[PDB]
Design a protein around this ligand. Structure first.
Ligand code: NAD
Ligand code: NAD
Ligand code: NAD
Ligand code: NAD
Lengths: 271, 271, 271, 271
């Protein structure tokens, strides 16, 4: 496997893309430190939350590949507990090489329906949770002295833009900034830091009231409806496609790639 | 003048570039709604704070140009107070056409010296404050039915990156995201939203211990010393050079320009 | 007048945007060196060519503003004649401060209908002609020892992309590269070099004949139909709108701005 | 073998990165159509040209990997010959899946030492040769009806800029544009088109008088010396590092990635 003997720390691992990364990296020989909030999301979020049962299933899948996994229910906004969990994982698994900062939320809203609390919540999770993840993981990669690879999941919205969520777009741009900023200062440790920018991905972020919320928002400005048009026939990527790119970024075959924005969007950022 | 009969809402107006904008737009015929925190900055900020007296001196300068000014001591993180101040100002001056979201802080710090507090404070002011500013002002532009122009002050850091301030670079990227996102949804009201990206500017953001904080950070990674190198002979722009660009963006001579990132950096973002 | 005493060299001056630059900079007090091919364009170009009479009309409009103007029929691909025309102009007018490299062509074609000759003709005009223009003018700017300002006209296509003209998008990207490259080496002379990226502009390039060509190419791929969608209500800028931006770039009010890509596209490059 | 049963068409295959792509893709199970000028380079080029013997050695290595290879000495500027070579290769090998447009030249020169001939030569090769490559291969990928993957080799210069080669920088931006424009019209055939942007690579592009040419150009503007500074400790990548990224883009593990600019530059485009 491409990641034999390695240990990856992955947030938002209970389902969707985060589960896809855990499962892919375990298959490549990595042991896993997996976290998810596994509970209530901000009230502007229209789809269903993840559950402790979801995270148990990620655990089951990773063990079925014969790898060790340390999993915990924790909010990426809770820096002290996140730091504690990472330290407990590393003590247990012996090292840390890879961070995937994947936990995030989306909430379609017309600009003038976004309350201060709404803005705060999305920014807190998508940016501060992302910064907390690097801050919990990086000193443990540095201590090993082997170099490493940190992948921050941004969005197509964080390279170009996405309409009907001012907070989300801001937050995903902030993630681009976090990648370039952490890349510059962590590069002397041979730690690569890169951001990944998916278009629409087939995950439970499409569940609950998402379709309705998107539908309602679009009505407020129909001129903005083609911002996510791809060049390929596909509008939607599978979580495995994102895991493909993130696996490559984790692997030694991207050892010279850092500070980069990697789109996996069937071309829509150039549309 | 290029802004006869217009009204501009300018944040961070007590000194530096914010004062230069007020003075420049006043000279152009605009009445002003000016706000500043005029007091203690986050503990990670190494330079000196502004005072209420700094804000009064901006008031004097604008009145000396024979223009009207409404001014208030207010934190851009305080949405409730900011909306009230804007609403009273617009009631007093008759309309709103222009927003310059200019209040911001900088703090040189090694990445591993940024506490959760420091990160939060820089993010809250540079992003949340910026968002609060548009939210308080844009409805007043809309109701006038004339279109208008909103300028968000980002940084070179928000187009490329700047080392030794993870929070700052992330926040200024977020500001790029705010300008594109607000441009997309407000465009139907004929409201332009653009961001401006200065390199170093000759302001009191250079005051107190800033040069010291800079050298101390630079010491942690000398390889990063040349990120801000210009193509022109000059490393530093004057606040009036930034006012030059923001005035163009406020004027009817940029009516078709929106969602843009305008650098004023002597070429450094391409260095 | 913002350009009193200055001299500007403008290509593609016979009509459209180039004429609007001449007229505007004349109104601001500059004398003008104006050239145009004023004759046949490559066969892939679907709209009507300019004529000697068109250039003569630009001359009269410039003379009407009480300015001096040296005008000549010349192909920007003709490096020797372009250099002599500049040299003659500078001998007559005393100096050179400003370059607007505006001459260019557009040709909608399905990717597989572009012949080698078509690709060559579009590249030669849009890239080599632009490069010849800088090589003919920049030595005379340097000679004066006053600094100066060079504006290359690219396109939204050269920031993002435009479908159905592989040559044109490539050429306009080359223009972004020319600007950054010349900015880097000419900056030591205090010569700024920037690129300007219009969306659709209301000029003879966008004639009926063009519309037909655009419709034909579009039929080959309907999904690519919304690449030029604006955030503002207007899809088309006026040539005066572009002249507003290029004038600001020529003026001392942008003395710190170099290597920049300035869009005038109502938001479309972020759509 | 990530590429069993596939056929890749690779230009500049006699040595350096082109040979590394041939060798790697053959190891991954692909058969090869390989071309190289294998002779005289433009006179502005300071390093050593390749020879027919170099190309024969590439043939030797692919054959030793137990793969089939069709190789020819041909200039990418020659559309007629290049197309005929591709056609003979596809008649022999059965199909075409992958294109690596890698043939390119570099020439350090102060801006005012670039002759019209130097400019045209660098442009014809890096841009027209690249376009000719796609035009010769893409119809063949289309006729197979299986989708495919086109990788254009640009440079870090084509994402940011590189000093002391106006032509080179312009050509590599043009390559960025080509990737986007072709991605747009070929995506309906499930053909991805992407560009790859290396920083310095350890190849014979460093041979002959390259070191001298670089040092001499640098003397004309010492301010520009740090444009290629990395965030990682290494300034230089190996051709295998680039082959890693091109291999990934050729593979099914980047099936949703198109119109992307992929830097392999240790972070220098964000420096
Ligand atoms: N789905 C898309 O179309 C799409 C497109 C672009 C980007 N993204 C981004 O990709 C990432 C993966 O999301 P997904 O599509 O797998 O959606 P998902 O909602 O199925 O997965 C996200 C997971 O993160 C967890 N999470 C959310 N907030 C958290 C917090 N504060 N602390 C800890 N865990 C938290 C959720 O419980 C959930 O398990 C997110 O960063 C998202 O913004 C998604
Ligand atoms: N000076 C530089 O080198 C530089 C470079 C790039 C960008 N910028 C940005 O330019 C903008 C203006 O900065 P400046 O150079 O004039 O520095 P400055 O400190 O002189 O002026 C900033 C002003 O904003 C005010 N302010 C700060 N936080 C506030 C808050 N929460 N609420 C209300 N007011 C607040 C301060 O009191 C101060 O008066 C900032 O956004 C800054 O980040 C500065
Ligand atoms: N009109 C648009 O929608 C649009 C959009 C983006 C960019 N542009 C760019 O704006 C610039 C000006 O174009 P325009 O809209 O005024 O169109 P236009 O055709 O009216 O003007 C272009 C002028 O340049 C001249 N010209 C063309 N090739 C020449 C050559 N080799 N040498 C000398 N002169 C030459 C033409 O004769 C014409 O007078 C061009 O670079 C064009 O690519 C136009
Ligand atoms: N070496 C670097 O530092 C570096 C950095 C960034 C990008 N690049 C780019 O990478 C690519 C590969 O170059 P390399 O580094 O392996 O150097 P190289 O000179 O060793 O390889 C280039 C090969 O292309 C061939 N070639 C050149 N022009 C040709 C033409 N018109 N027709 C056919 N073949 C031709 C040359 O003969 C040579 O064998 C080029 O596009 C180059 O511009 C190189």
């Amino acid at each position: 496997g491409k990641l034999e003997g390695r240990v990856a720390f992955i947030t938002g691992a209970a389902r969707g893309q985060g589960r896809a990364h855990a499962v892919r990296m375990a298959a490549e020989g990595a042991d896993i430190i997996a976290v998810d909030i596994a509970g209530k999301l901000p009230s502007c979020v229209p789809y269903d939350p993840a559950s402790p049962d979801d995270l148990s299933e990620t655990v089951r899948l990773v063990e079925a590949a014969n790898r060790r996994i340390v999993a915990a229910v924790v909010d990426t906004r809770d820096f002290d507990r996140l730091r504690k969990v990472v330290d407990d994982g590393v003590a247990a698994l012996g090292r840390l090489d890879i961070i995937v900062a994947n936990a995030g939320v989306a909430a379609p809203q017309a600009w003038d329906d976004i309350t201060p609390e709404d803005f705060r919540d999305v920014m807190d999770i998508n940016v501060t949770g992302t910064w907390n993840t690097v801050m919990a993981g990086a000193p443990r990669i540095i201590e090993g002295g082997r170099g490493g690879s940190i992948i921050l999941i941004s969005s197509a919205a964080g390279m170009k833009m996405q309409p009907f969520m001012i907070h989300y777009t801001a937050s995903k741009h902030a993630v681009t900034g976090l990648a370039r900023a952490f890349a510059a200062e962590l590069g002397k440790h041979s730690i690569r830091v890169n951001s990944v920018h998916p278009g629409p991905v087939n995950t439970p972020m499409g569940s609950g009231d998402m379709v309705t919320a998107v539908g309602q928002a679009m009505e407020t400005n129909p001129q903005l409806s083609h911002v996510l048009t791809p060049f390929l026939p596909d509008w939607v990527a599978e979580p495995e496609d994102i895991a493909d790119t993130v696996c490559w970024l984790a692997s030694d075959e991207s050892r010279k790639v850092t500070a980069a924005q990697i789109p996996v969007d069937q071309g829509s950022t150039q549309y």
